[PDB]
Amino acid sequence: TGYDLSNSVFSPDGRNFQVEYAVKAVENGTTSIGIKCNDGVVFAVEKLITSKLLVPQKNVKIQVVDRHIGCVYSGLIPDGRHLVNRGREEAASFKKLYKTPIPIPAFADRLGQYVQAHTLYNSVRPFGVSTIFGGVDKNGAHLYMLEPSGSYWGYKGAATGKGRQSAKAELEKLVDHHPEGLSAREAVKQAAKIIYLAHEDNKEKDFELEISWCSLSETNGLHKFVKGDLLQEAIDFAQKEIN
Amino acid sequence: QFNPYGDNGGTILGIAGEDFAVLAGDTRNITDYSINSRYEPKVFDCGDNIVMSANGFAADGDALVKRFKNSVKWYHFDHNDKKLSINSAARNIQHLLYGKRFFPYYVHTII
Amino acid sequence: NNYDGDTVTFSPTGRLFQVEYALEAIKQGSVTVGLRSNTHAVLVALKRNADELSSYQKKIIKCDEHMGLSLAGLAPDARVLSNYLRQQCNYSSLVFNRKLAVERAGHLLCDKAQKNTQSYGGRPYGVGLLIIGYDKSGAHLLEFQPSGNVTELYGTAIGARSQGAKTYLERTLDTFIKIDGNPDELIKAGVEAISQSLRDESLTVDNLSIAIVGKDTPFTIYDGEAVAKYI
């Protein structure tokens, strides 16, 4: 054997074990989710409070690309940052040449091709993050989830991290119970609940909730963080549902 | 054709005493026959008890002072906060100026 | 085991052993403590010597008039990273006439350390850093790890037996955070914190290294007889 010792090597199955090993690093990370709604998307993430010494609200994990795209990820946090930095360069060159802000599907492939490129050579390591991202463009709302292999799809709801199965099960219920659609303000509240429910798989340390959102009506198509009253309202909603 | 230089006028003056030294300069800034500013300082405190002025083409003057001020900053970092002596500052400025020997800073410099 | 030959290789459980071995170099390094209030931020560093004839390895480095760090691990790597910070702080000043935010400083270090963990040939940085600073949003303290992970904190400690100081600061959190407009008391809290990581040795005059930055205080380092006040 030894097929797993080098990246970009096919096993006799037809698998790249190094990418599957990177997935294990993603599975190890904290829970992050994405919820598509009527006229936008909502992102949320679990921030494990390792210590009392962590400053609240000042270790921001959700990142913005351009002015209309939000990105969140689980796994090796630095790898995620590297991917977003690239995303920002890709979005900047698109706007520079084509004037219009980069569409979400276009942006999705830019990250997709870049992550896929890191499975082509043994001189690079695959990304140790699954990245949930999306936003609002001319064609409306889009939510995506990108994996270490470079594989991505459009989603109604997306989840990754240690509590992905708990979050997925909860996401599947929303899709079934709301066929006509979920509103932006609703999706924010649901996102809080799902992070709290997904926290049961990581319940040693208590956590800090962080939510962001793009919405054509609520945020005017721009990415904004959910803060203050709207955040506390979503936290209270989630606290009420676990009990 | 594009002329990269200009003349911002003004004048400067340096005199040395026994235990002191002065560097003076008028605060007028001009182009051609127009006044740009009646108060635009061009004599600067660069730290380590060194005062500097690069009079002539103001863009090159400001760029040079900026670089020398930055040179003083890194002299501290690289040499354990040692004070940059006036003779060492002079020699450092020679290299800044001569570095652009074939596209000069159009300035009369005094420290 | 078979997956620690270089940084470009993942283990079957999804671990980067070279990054973890670099992390191990920090644990071997001498203890250093960071803590802040709302007005000031303080670094306290236990310096280490080769023997009684040798000098004590300088742990604290200045980056700008408003920012600097303390190191634990490979000192040459700290020099590279501190030099990079100095340039980024300086780029911000010359180009934008703007003091570099301590948060951006951390983001820049994270991204620089990350590139070394994903490429063949290179190696991770073998040092941990505690960056303090005072900017437009008040006092700050960062903890840099060579995995790339940067973390903003009220207080922390890295190095050998850093768990003693880190537990102390976790208890003292409510006290030292409100030491506003008082440098000497914030330092005392830091000197008392680093004392919890001491074994057999005690804080002497050429052993202790303290730095401070704040509202009306440029980043300045205290060594030798200047720290005798706090022993």
Add this chain to the structure above:
Amino acid sequence: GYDRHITIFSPEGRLYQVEYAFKATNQTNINSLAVRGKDCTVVISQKKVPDKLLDPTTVSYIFCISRTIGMVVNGPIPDARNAALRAKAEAAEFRYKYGYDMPCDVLAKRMANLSQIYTQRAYMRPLGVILTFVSVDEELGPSIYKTDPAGYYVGYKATATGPKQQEITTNLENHFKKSKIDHINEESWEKVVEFAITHMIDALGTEFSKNDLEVGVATKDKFFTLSAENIEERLVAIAEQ
């Protein structure tokens, strides 16, 4: 045995990395099929959307390379998209340099030559995909050309790709033995699509709903994919016969 890790010869003259890239082809467990009409070329592929959270409209293995050329992939989506983007860039450049639309067979050769390079150069791995290019070429007429990880390529009267490719292949072989011709003798593309689906149903032995299939159609001066309702309309026609 490092001769199995990179693209160099084994003692028996084999490239194991190429062979294992072929096995990655069936990792998606999807079967494709391509047939030619008189005026058109129809390609169909299974569409399996297992997760309920997926947006089914974004799940696709058929690509519009140029206005005239279409491409379906058998293999993982990351390599599929890698091959698609490159093919698009090649087809665009070809038009700019030589002043006419890139032919289906020429693109297939170009992508095959790229695939060949990965089998000879060590630092590049082969893509774990089989690319099936379809068009109505202005010179050669309806065309099906297929590329694999070995860098092999060839034109087809019809073809199939996937896990149950052999069953589909023989099903088509037996039809062309019977019909005695190189294509589907049919006027409209609508009925060529109906033929394609019908023969896939017989070979695989499964029934299809509108969301179980994905259809691409190449006509003169344009290639286009069919919507769920376009396929549903097509499935109704088969059922009522």
Add this chain to the structure above:
Amino acid sequence: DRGVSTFSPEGRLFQVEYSLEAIKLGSTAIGIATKEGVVLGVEKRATSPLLESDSIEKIVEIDRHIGCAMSGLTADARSMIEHARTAAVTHNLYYDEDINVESLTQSVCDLALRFGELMSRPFGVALLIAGHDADDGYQLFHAEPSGTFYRYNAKAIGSGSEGAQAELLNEWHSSLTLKEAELLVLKILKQVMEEKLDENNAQLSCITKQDGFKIYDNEKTAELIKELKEKEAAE
């Protein structure tokens, strides 16, 4: 094999740690810093009696105010010295002044870790950089291939280092004269050296503010050796 810039599980660079073993095999070099000057002494260690010992150059001038002694793979030191000399002279050209001993040492140590896959391996030589400047006075530095440098009051490197360092620990005090330091280096060298110490197989040097860096003659060192033996027999 394995990467050149690889970390061990304990958190050390293999190649740096292995280069330290090469330095232990090297000939002894001792440095002692006083308020009257810094003394540098080395074991020459001629591999054969036919080798002309005065051609063994293990003590070296970097500038008039900075000297340098070496131990280990001494061939590797040539480019380090060349860099140090250029750094010293270049700084004088840019700033019309002598360069600080620490700044010089730091410049040399920057080369140390510029290896990987830049040069192919670390240096296999340790340097004792002694000098004087107006700011920090007389200084002795130990520059390693790890890129690290420590300032020392006294330091021994090479094969007899750990034995000599323990001896320097006892003997050194802050009021040593230059003459006392000269004898102390000779004394400690004679202890750790394999062959019997004389003017031909051991070399002394010093750096003073007034006269700068000076390598001693074999005539001058011989008198210090004779002065040393008499003083040890005298009690």
Add this chain to the structure above:
Amino acid sequence: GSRRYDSRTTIFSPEGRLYQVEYALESISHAGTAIGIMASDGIVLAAERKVTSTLLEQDTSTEKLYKLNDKIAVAVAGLTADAEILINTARIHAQNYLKTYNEDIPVEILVRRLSDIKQGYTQHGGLRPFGVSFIYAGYDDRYGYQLYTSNPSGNYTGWKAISVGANTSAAQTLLQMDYKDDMKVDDAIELALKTLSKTTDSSALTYDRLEFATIRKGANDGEVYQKIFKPQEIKDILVKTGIT
């Protein structure tokens, strides 16, 4: 990374030998024997073709003997393809020298440069060495007739008579036995063929399994002529000496 698959072609063994050079020499020892013999009035180059097939086109073939310029020729032993790379370089080097100095290149200079190229592949670059040994036969107005040999190590030496390729041990003993300094070309021609005839792994030495060449001053007055022997000319010289 790629380190895993590096053979490290340019390293020393514990004994102080270059693995790849030693193995390239092992390769060359299976190649068809080539013999060079230097006489006082010319040089002979003789070489055995590697197990010939009856359908091989013999007259329009070049495997062993190549022409570098009008005055210098080489006999090859090893990989033909490798040799041709080096030959084209050597041909160019000769023309560069002529263009620079308006004089034909001295034999040793050409040999040294070609040998220096081989040396480079054993010390740096991480590539395999050229699996080739040359016998250089040439003439210049300084040293007159000269024989040299170079091998994959890049080491070259001068000879009066020398063999490369297969059975050099047996061939060199036979040459050392019958060679003498006042020898003529026609005698050297006979010695070369007699040596090959005994050291050959074939049943009997024939014209179709041989390449032959002479560098004489047999032209008209103080000028050198290269003669690459035709199949019929090898057939005649083989009968003339009484081997067939």
Add this chain to the structure above:
Amino acid sequence: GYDRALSIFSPDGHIFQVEYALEAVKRGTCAVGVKGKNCVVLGCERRSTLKLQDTRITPSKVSKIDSHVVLSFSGLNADSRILIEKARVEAQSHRLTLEDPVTVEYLTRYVAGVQQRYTQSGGVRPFGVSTLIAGFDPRDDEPKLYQTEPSGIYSSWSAQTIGRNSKTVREFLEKNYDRKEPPATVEECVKLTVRSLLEVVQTGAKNIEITVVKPDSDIVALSSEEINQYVTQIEQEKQE
């Protein structure tokens, strides 16, 4: 470019590639250097398994770097040519800029620097060569003899040998060479050099090369008969 670090440290603190390059030197034919009162002599072994050689055209073991300095060697022959070429170029470059020929120490220091560079440069192996560099500085009558080796270290020698069985001839030179009184004349210096090679060589026929260098660019190589006379004289005195 090929980047691999071939010369690297081992756990015990050895660079094996440099040490294996020394083994190549140990395999090479013996070379000896003996400096007298007003001259230096470079003796060289030539192995006698090679008959049918052409000694006119065969590369000589001793090479002139300039008109006043010479270089002999032991080890890989192909490697030595590269060092000799570089040294010859540097010799002319020094005359061009300094307006003065190289000193023997300077030339040695250069050659040694080249050897060292190949011990910590990526993609290259060390030179499998040790050199003896001898000559006289410009306008100087003091003899100079230096040695270099693959690692890059160099040093001056009153007399020295390198190559195969060099430890035997070094043993001989160590007792036979007096520092207080070196070979006063050319004859004495050549004889001592030939004697030292006769401990190792085999026969004193075409196995020994002798090159004598004297001040002011006075270098000459001895012929077979000239060397054979020393061999004949030494053997007759030996039978006693």
Add this chain to the structure above:
Amino acid sequence: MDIILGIRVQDSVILASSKAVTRGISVLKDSDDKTRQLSPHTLMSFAGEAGDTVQFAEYIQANIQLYSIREDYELSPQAVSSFVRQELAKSIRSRRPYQVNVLIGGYDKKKNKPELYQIDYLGTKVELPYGAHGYSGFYTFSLLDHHYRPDMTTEEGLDLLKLCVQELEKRMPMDFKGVIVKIVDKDGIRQVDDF
């Protein structure tokens, strides 16, 4: 720089070269040797642009000396001249060409013949019985056309050369401060000290 002459006779080549080095309205030196020995039996005189002349001459000198050491053999005058021409032929299409004109006087030991080559800064080589560069030629060529014979001795060649220098001293506008004469023959290169 300015005046460089060359006369090939029966058994030798004779090169005369002016001693004056003028800049502006000042003769800075009146004992300048405008020549370099490329090899024991090859001498090159030079004239042209300030700095370029010596820089080029010494660069050629180094290359020929390097060749001599490498091969332990002296290049023929023909070979040296061809090397020099090629260097000037490269130079002329460089960013900044060498503005140097040269005469190469050599004695070929293999042929036992003197050889004089005239090469200008463009890389225009010609073998001649007599040569000159600059304005000198406008007087000396016609003079030598008349008085030169191919079978002359070295002494006759020197008298023929004196006749040129006298004519140049009479009719040339500038004071070139006499000439340094050198003879190249079978025994090598030597300088005539009283001219």
Add this chain to the structure above:
Amino acid sequence: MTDRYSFSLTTFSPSGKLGQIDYALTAVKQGVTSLGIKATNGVVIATEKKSSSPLAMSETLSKVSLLTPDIGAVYSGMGPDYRVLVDKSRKVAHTSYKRIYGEYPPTKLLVSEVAKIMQEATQSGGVRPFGVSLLIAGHDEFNGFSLYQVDPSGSYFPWKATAIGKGSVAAKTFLEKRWNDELELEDAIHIALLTLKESVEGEFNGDTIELAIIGDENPDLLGYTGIPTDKGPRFRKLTSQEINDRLEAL
């Protein structure tokens, strides 16, 4: 990133073998039989068209390729390697010859260029050798007709007739019996079809056999008229119909 494989993947083993070349030759052995026969007034090159599937159109896949108007090539081994070699061979004929001399290269020199390319894959960094043996048939004014074999090592040999690939051992023995130096082109084509039938197992007709010749100039295939010196390509690919005609009188 970047091609870090700057070292040879083909190296000498202790026994003196070049492993990757030997293994490339093993790949050629597995390949389908192709052959070449040289006549007095022409050359014939032939091979079996092994169809990957009956749905595949074997006309689109050309095993016999035109390199120049007077030179053609066929192979045994790995088709993809062959295809890129033809592309490079066609280009090198222009860049390294026709754009310099204003005429097409002679067979031996084009062969030499192809051999160089294949030799470089045997020694250059980060590449395996080509897994093919080429048979190149061609004509030029001063050398006449010629037939060359080019192996993975980069070695090339001129042949009167030969075969490579699957049943080359038997095919070469067959050609030895039939070949003489007085063969006319039509007699060589006849022998080629006989030799090839031995190695072919399934169908044997113009659709499963690919065959081309280097013979007389073809003015009809030139595409233009008016230049007397330009007389048309000597390379001609025999049609499916033309092969079947000769199979009846077999």
